[PDB]
Amino acid sequence: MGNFDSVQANPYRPRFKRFNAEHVNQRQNQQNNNNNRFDRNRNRQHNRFKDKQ
Amino acid sequence: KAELVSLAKLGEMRTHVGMVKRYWNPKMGFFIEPERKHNNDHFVLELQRQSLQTAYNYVKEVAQNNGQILFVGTKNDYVKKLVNNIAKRVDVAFITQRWLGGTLTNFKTLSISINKLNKLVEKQAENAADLTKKENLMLSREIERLEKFFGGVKSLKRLPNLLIVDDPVYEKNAVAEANILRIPVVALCNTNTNPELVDFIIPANNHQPQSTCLLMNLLADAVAEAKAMPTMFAYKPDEEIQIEIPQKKQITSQRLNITRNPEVLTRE
Amino acid sequence: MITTTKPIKAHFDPVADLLTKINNARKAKLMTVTTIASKLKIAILEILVKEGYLANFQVLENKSKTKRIVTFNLKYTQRRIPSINGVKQISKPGLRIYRPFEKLPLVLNGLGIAIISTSDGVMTDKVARLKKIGGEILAYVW
Amino acid sequence: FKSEFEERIVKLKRISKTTKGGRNMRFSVLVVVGNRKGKIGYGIAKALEVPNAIKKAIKAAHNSLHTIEIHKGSIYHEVIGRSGASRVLLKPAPQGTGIIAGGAIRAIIELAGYSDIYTKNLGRNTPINMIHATMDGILKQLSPRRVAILRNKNLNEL
RNA sequence: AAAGAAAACUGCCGAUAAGGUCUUCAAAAAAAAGAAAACU
RNA sequence: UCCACACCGUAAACGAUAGAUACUAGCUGUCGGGGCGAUCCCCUCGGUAGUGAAGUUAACACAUUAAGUAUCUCGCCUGG
RNA sequence: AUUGGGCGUAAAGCAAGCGCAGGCGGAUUGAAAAGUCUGGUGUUAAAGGCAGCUGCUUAACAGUUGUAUGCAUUGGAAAC
Numbered sequence: 016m017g018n019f020d021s022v023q024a025n026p027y028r029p030r031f032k033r034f035n036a037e038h039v040n041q042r043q044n045q046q047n048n049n050n051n052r053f054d055r056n057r058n059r060q061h062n063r064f065k066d067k068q
Numbered sequence: 069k070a071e072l073v074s075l076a077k078l079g080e081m082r083t084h085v086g087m088v089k090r091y092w093n094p095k096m097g098f099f100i101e102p103e104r105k106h107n108n109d110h111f112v113l114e115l116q117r118q119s120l121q122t123a124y125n126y127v128k129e130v131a132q133n134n135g136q137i138l139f140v141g142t143k144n145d146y147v148k149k150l151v152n153n154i155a156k157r158v159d160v161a162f163i164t165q166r167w168l169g170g171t172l173t174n175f176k177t178l179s180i181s182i183n184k185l186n187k188l189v190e191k192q193a194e195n196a197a198d199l200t201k202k203e204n205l206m207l208s209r210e211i212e213r214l215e216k217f218f219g220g221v222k223s224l225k226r227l228p229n230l231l232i233v234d235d236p237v238y239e240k241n242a243v244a245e246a247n248i249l250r251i252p253v254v255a256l257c258n259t260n261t262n263p264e265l266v267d268f269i270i271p272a273n274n275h276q277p278q279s280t281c282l283l284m285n286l287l288a289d290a291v292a293e294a295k296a297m298p299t300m301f302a303y304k305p306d307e308e309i310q311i312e313i314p315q316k317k318q319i320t321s322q323r324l325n326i327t328r329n330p331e332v333l334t335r336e
Numbered sequence: 337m338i339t340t341t342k343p344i345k346a347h348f349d350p351v352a353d354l355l356t357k358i359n360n361a362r363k364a365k366l367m368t369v370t371t372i373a374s375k376l377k378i379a380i381l382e383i384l385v386k387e388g389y390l391a392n393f394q395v396l397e398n399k400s401k402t403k404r405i406v407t408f409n410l411k412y413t414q415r416r417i418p419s420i421n422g423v424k425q426i427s428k429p430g431l432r433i434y435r436p437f438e439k440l441p442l443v444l445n446g447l448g449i450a451i452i453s454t455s456d457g458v459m460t461d462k463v464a465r466l467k468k469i470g471g472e473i474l475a476y477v478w
Numbered sequence: 479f480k481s482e483f484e485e486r487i488v489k490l491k492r493i494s495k496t497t498k499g500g501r502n503m504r505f506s507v508l509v510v511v512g513n514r515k516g517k518i519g520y521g522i523a524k525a526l527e528v529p530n531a532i533k534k535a536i537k538a539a540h541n542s543l544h545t546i547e548i549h550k551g552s553i554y555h556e557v558i559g560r561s562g563a564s565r566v567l568l569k570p571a572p573q574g575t576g577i578i579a580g581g582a583i584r585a586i587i588e589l590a591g592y593s594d595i596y597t598k599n600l601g602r603n604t605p606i607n608m609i610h611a612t613m614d615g616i617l618k619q620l621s622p623r624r625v626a627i628l629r630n631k632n633l634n635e636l
Numbered sequence: 637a638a639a640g641a642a643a644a645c646u647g648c649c650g651a652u653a654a655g656g657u658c659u660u661c662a663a664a665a666a667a668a669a670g671a672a673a674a675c676u
Numbered sequence: 677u678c679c680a681c682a683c684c685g686u687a688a689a690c691g692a693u694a695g696a697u698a699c700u701a702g703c704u705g706u707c708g709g710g711g712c713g714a715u716c717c718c719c720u721c722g723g724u725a726g727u728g729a730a731g732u733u734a735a736c737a738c739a740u741u742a743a744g745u746a747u748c749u750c751g752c753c754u755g756g
Numbered sequence: 757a758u759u760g761g762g763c764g765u766a767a768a769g770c771a772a773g774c775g776c777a778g779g780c781g782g783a784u785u786g787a788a789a790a791g792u793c794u795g796g797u798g799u800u801a802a803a804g805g806c807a808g809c810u811g812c813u814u815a816a817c818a819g820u821u822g823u824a825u826g827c828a829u830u831g832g833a834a835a836c
């Protein structure tokens with residue numbers, strides 16, 4: 016019952032695969048985080064003029 | 069359709085011969101040939117080529133993508149000059165002398181040390197007449213020491229992303245540092261090694277000054293092709309691979325000298 | 337036609353015999369083991385392979401039809417770590433454990449399995465709850 | 479280390495060695511660092527002064543941070559963590575009981591994120607070994623998805 | 637004309653009033669990212 | 677202290693480790709039976725040792741002759 | 757320490773053996789059904805127990821309905 020001799024004689028197989036190249040997505044998520052910093056400094060500048068008349 | 073080394077050449081270079089059966093790790097049964105009816109331990113040639121191709125494949129993506137590979141061979145004299153030869157051919161960091169404790173895990177202190185080496189070297193290159201004779205000779209000797217023990221590590225500024233080990237047994241410190249820091253390490257196991265420590269095992273010899281040289285150049289050849297300079301032994305025919313056996317009975321691989329292991333001094 | 341080389345002997349307790357064999361094989365990373373075959377061991381092993389902790393179990397007989405031994409293998413993954421985590425026997429010889437249906441145990445908040453042979457041979461705890469019938473409790477396997 | 483990671487002292491012993499005249503005294507601290515969302519580590523350090531001991535302990539705790547998974551805020555299945563002669567029993571709890579832990583386990587449970595948890599210290603009362611036992615119990619936990627991938631069933635369905 | 641070694645050695649030698657510091661404590665420690673602004 | 681016949685029944689009577697049963701890497705010795713046929717050495721089945729990983733221990737350490745994974749039975753322990 | 761502990765170095769393996777009664781006990785088949793599980797009926801006094809409600813200015817409290825545990829008998833299940 017169930018016999019199938021799959022054969023998995025690939026033990027202690029390699030865990031690492033590529034040369035940390037997947038980091039391409041880590042560079043895109045860091046670029047998207049820098050664009051959200053430039054717009055926050057424009058809107059803080061517009062609010063200083065309503066409290067001076 | 070990709071090719072590689074030749075099967076006749078592996079048999080003739082003695083890369084399918086391990087060490088004496090008395091000295092063997094029970095965890096290496098997968099690669100060993102029908103040793104059940106055999107004298108000295110050996111390996112399978114098909115498994116050898118597959119493992120070699122995998123290690124070759126892995127090192128090439130790293131070297132093409134601008135990784136930093138470190139070679140550490142501080143064993144037989146031949147191996148030091150062997151490791152030196154790859155350094156001349158490719159601008160890879162090397163550790164030919166003794167592996168300092170914490171070369172990787174405590175990289176900060178060794179980074180400070182190599183920075184001191186570089187700073188002292190450049191001041192001396194700039195020169196001055198104040199150096200005179202006595203202090204200059206003393207200063208030259210410290211400089212000599214930091215190249216002999218850090219001459220191949222000065223180039224790199226960050227932890228390497230891969231290690232190539234000649235003997236996992238002899239470099240137990242190096243492989244332990246690689247394992248704890250989760251860095252790939254490849255090694256040439258010789259029937260007496262724990263497979264957990266190494267990542268890409270490449271069943272081969274380690275006592276023959278011919279098998280060792282052939283395999284080390286093959287890995288260097290992957291790096292050299294990735295770096296875009298012509299290869300030396302990989303993807304090459306018969307006429308150009310022939311190599312000689314170093315001098316200093318006959319080149320072999322039997323492990324003896326057992327009489328130098330008596331009982332630990334005891335009694336009362 | 338499967339051949340062997342070693343003589344096969346076994347301990348007397350058929351539930352913990354398998355349990356000792358399974359636990360030792362798990363700890364030693366061994367794959368192929370052999371033991372003497374009994375109908376209780378065959379049936380409990382059958383539900384075990386249905387519940388998914390072991391892969392295959394083949395029972396064979398002698399050419400004389402006087403002896404049977406069951407030789408099972410474990411289901412190791414690619415990285416060579418087993419699926420079984422721990423086995424412990426309750427109804428040891430001497431002290432037999434009898435629990436009614438309402439007091440049928442739940443192993444590891446239902447993740448593990450409790451093996452219960454009530455009246456229609458061995459049966460897993462979940463299907464035993466479905467039938468609302470209880471009985472002998474052999475061992476906890478998770 | 480850049481997280482909600484809170485720091486707290488779980489024990490401050492006073493160790494000393496003997497030299498050729500006098501006793502070299504150093505303070506030892508056992509700090510438990512946790513972000514209260516699934517990241518928690520522990521660090522024990524010794525130094526000539528309490529601030530430096532604390533400094534070394536906090537540095538060590540952030541270097542060794544383990545990952546923690548929660549099910550409904552609690553532990554999925556009952557587990558006994560063993561470390562030396564210290565045995566700590568963890569048991570799933572219904573939402574509302576609160577943290578019924580005390581001492582090193584209570585500090586660990588709060589810093590890990592877990593809410594409802596039943597605990598009992600069945601062994602010794604040395605804080606490091608209960609935490610060792612506590613960490614062993616929490617790290618040995620099996621998710622109901624790893625067993626699914628192993629035994630090949632459907633996510634959580636029976 | 638190398639296989640050697642080489643050797644212990646002993647006399648005698650007892651005791652030390654009581655209770656006693658010393659680790660106080662880590663809570664952990666003050667300040668950069670700002671701007672600045674038109675006005676009829 | 678020795679001998680013969682009668683008692684005494686205690687020892688650090690120690691492997692400081694009750695007996696039986698099943699499973700769990702290996703290496704180096706040595707002993708016995710058996711197989712081959714120069715010894716020597718190779719294999720099998722057992723007894724006695726050393727080294728040694730998983731495993732166990734508070735640590736020392738044990739580690740296929742377990743103090744490991746388990747079952748049966750007996751004896752014993754509960755601060756000084 | 758049945759659930760829920762130990763006996764190498766901390767308390768604890770009798771000096772060892774032959775051992776009845778006791779405890780435990782190979783595989784397969786048949787029957788019975790003592791264990792084991794389950795259905796029906798009877799009973800397990802009332803107060804107390806837990807849940808809900810009412811009444812006392814709410815409570816404490818009182819009342820109210822619900823709420824098991826075991827035994828016996830009968831009818832089945834046959835894995836141990």
Ligand SMILES: [Mg+2]
């Ligand atoms: Mg002095």
Ligand SMILES: [Mg+2]
Binds near residue numbers: 647
């Ligand atoms: Mg005199």
Ligand SMILES: [Mg+2]
């Ligand atoms: Mg005196």
Ligand SMILES: [Mg+2]
């Ligand atoms: Mg006196």
Ligand SMILES: [Mg+2]
Binds near residue numbers: 661663
């Ligand atoms: Mg304080």
Ligand SMILES: [Mg+2]
């Ligand atoms: Mg006595």
Ligand SMILES: [Mg+2]
């Ligand atoms: Mg004696």
Ligand SMILES: [Mg+2]
């Ligand atoms: Mg030993």
Ligand SMILES: [Mg+2]
């Ligand atoms: Mg007393």
Ligand SMILES: [Mg+2]
Binds near residue numbers: 761762
């Ligand atoms: Mg006790």
Ligand SMILES: [Mg+2]
């Ligand atoms: Mg004692």
Ligand SMILES: [Mg+2]
Binds near residue numbers: 769
């Ligand atoms: Mg005894």
Ligand SMILES: [Mg+2]
């Ligand atoms: Mg005794």
Ligand SMILES: [Mg+2]
């Ligand atoms: Mg007897």
Ligand SMILES: [Mg+2]
């Ligand atoms: Mg009897």
Ligand SMILES: [Mg+2]
């Ligand atoms: Mg039977």
